[PDB]
Design a protein around this ligand. Structure first.
Ligand SMILES: Cc1cc2nc3c(=O)[nH]c(=O)nc-3n(C[C@H](O)[C@H](O)[C@H](O)COP(=O)(O)OP(=O)(O)OC[C@H]3O[C@@H](n4cnc5c(N)ncnc54)[C@H](O)[C@@H]3O)c2cc1C
Length: 439
């Protein structure tokens, strides 16, 4: 039609920022991309660096952005993970050719992406956004700080926040922890298992990620005990395939002599307690005069998890949802944002957007769902993707991709120790590679 070109800031050059830059460019917009680090890739850049505070609670601490540990492999098959128009297939020669590869293979994929779509060369590196303010007129000023202690600022029609949400930790509440004498850490600082050699380690977490770290630690630890509050029956349970790993429901009490008692009665002397309890949203740079808040991991209000109703479309967020396949979701979110900014498609009125968020909050409340699951969309994530695709006029998520997700979700819960290397959906792989031909 008669489109409109906007000048847009992108905050972050992880996977979300990379695809957002591409989708804004494809729709005719100009952009400035700010990346605090020295390379693109965000979380997928493994670093052995860890924060000086093992609990990552000291407010003046240096921040390490990545939470990856060294042996991490994807928890999704690579066919499922790729951008919709950029299949995450094997390289022509070399690399990690496994269906569930290591993090290095994902980073290489994002770097190839950044080159293929001309995004990488435009990222302003070592530019940390420290302040984002709305100007009288509806424009935005992004102020940034550089490596040398320099910095600057720039005005924008719109700002897309792509800063990730897997860096600022949240924690478990452990009874008696104030008198427990051992080592306490957050998994944000977990990298390698060797320093746990012959230690007794408690891992607190209910996700399959906590099981991954437990199995990694169990390579050297004397004993690994998982406190998994979603478990209610049959503990203490040995982990199949491991002689030195046990599953529990929850810590009942920690003691001054180092012992930890689980609800199932198991008592053990513990050297290390690791919180694998996840993260919180954190946008210290963002000044909205209270229009956007973060409250027990509810961000917003955000229309469709993206647009603050009062500030839409000049402010938007890519990659808020969790329990998702992230790369195609961020792709479709930023495709939607770009088409809105260009005028090719419309948003509802501010009042209608605000009513939609309120309706969603009341559905949650009428279903007993606590605040902190507001952006958890694991059950209907591809319906959400398809809603975005229909807004943009893009194809819907492939059926093989829905089915692969259900299959790996089932295998991850049933066989956490083997789902990455033993699978039975070769027929879905066949389908996926068929659709990949056109690219
Ligand atoms: C342990 C772990 C395992 C995972 N495994 C999988 C998996 O197997 N498969 C999968 O598809 N997904 C997985 N994910 C999800 C992963 O987060 C997404 O794949 C995706 O990387 C989200 O990227 P992002 O761009 O939103 O955030 P990030 O990767 O965090 O990137 C955000 C970027 O913004 C930059 N930034 C932050 N603040 C500023 C600022 N103020 N100014 C300038 N720049 C800034 C950061 O430096 C960073 O580069 C995993 C996540 C974790 C934590």
């Amino acid at each position: 039609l008669s489109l409109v070109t906007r000048h847009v800031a992108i905050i972050g050059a992880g996977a979300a920022g990379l695809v957002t830059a591409r989708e804004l460019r494809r729709e005719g917009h100009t952009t400035t991309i700010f990346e605090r680090g020295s390379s693109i890739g965000g979380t997928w850049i493994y670093t052995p660096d860890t924060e000086p505070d093992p609990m990552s609670q000291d407010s003046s601490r240096p921040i390490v952005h990545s939470s990856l540990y060294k042996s991490l492999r994807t928890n999704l098959p690579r066919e499922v993970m790729g951008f919709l128009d950029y299949p995450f297939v094997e390289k022509t020669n070399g690399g990690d050719r496994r269906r569930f590869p290591g993090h290095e293979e994902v980073l290489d994929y994002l770097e190839r992406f950044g080159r293929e779509f001309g995004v990488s060369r435009e990222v302003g590196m070592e530019k940390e956004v420290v302040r984002v303010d709305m100007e009288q007129g509806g424009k935005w000023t992004v102020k940034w700080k550089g490596k040398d202690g320099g910095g600057g600022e720039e005005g924008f029609d719109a700002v897309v926040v792509c800063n990730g949400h897997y860096t600022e930790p949240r924690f478990a509440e452990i009874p008696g922890i104030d008198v427990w004498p051992g080592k306490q850490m957050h998994s944000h600082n977990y990298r390698i298992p060797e320093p746990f050699h012959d230690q007794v380690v408690v891992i607190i977490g209910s996700s399959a990620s906590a099981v991954d770290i437990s199995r990694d630690v169990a390579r050297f630890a004397k004993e690994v005990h998982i406190a998994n509050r979603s478990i209610t029956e049959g503990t203490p349970a040995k982990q199949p395939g491991y002689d030195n790993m046990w599953l529990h429901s929850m810590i009942k009490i920690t003691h001054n002599d180092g012992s930890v008692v689980f609800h199932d009665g198991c008592s053990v002397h513990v050297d290390v307690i690791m919180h694998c309890t996840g993260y919180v949203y954190n946008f210290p740079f963002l000044n909205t005069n209270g229009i956007v808040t973060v409250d027990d991991n509810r961000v917003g209000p955000l229309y469709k998890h993206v647009f603050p109703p009062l500030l839409a479309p000049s402010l938007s967020f890519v990659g808020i949802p969790w329990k998702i396949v992230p790369f195609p979701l961020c792709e479709l979110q930023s495709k939607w944002i770009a088409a809105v900014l260009s005028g090719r498609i419309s948003l509802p009125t501010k009042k209608e957007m605000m009513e939609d968020v309120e309706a969603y909050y009341k559905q949650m409340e009428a279903a007993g769902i606590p605040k902190r699951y507001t952006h958890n969309i694991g059950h209907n994530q591809f319906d959400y993707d398809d809603w975005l695709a229909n807004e943009c006029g893009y194809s819907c998520i492939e059926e093989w991709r829905r089915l692969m997700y259900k299959e790996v979700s089932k295998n991850r819960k049933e066989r956490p120790e083997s789902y990455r290397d033993e699978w039975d959906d070769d027929h879905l792989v066949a389908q996926a590679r068929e659709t990949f031909s056109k690219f």
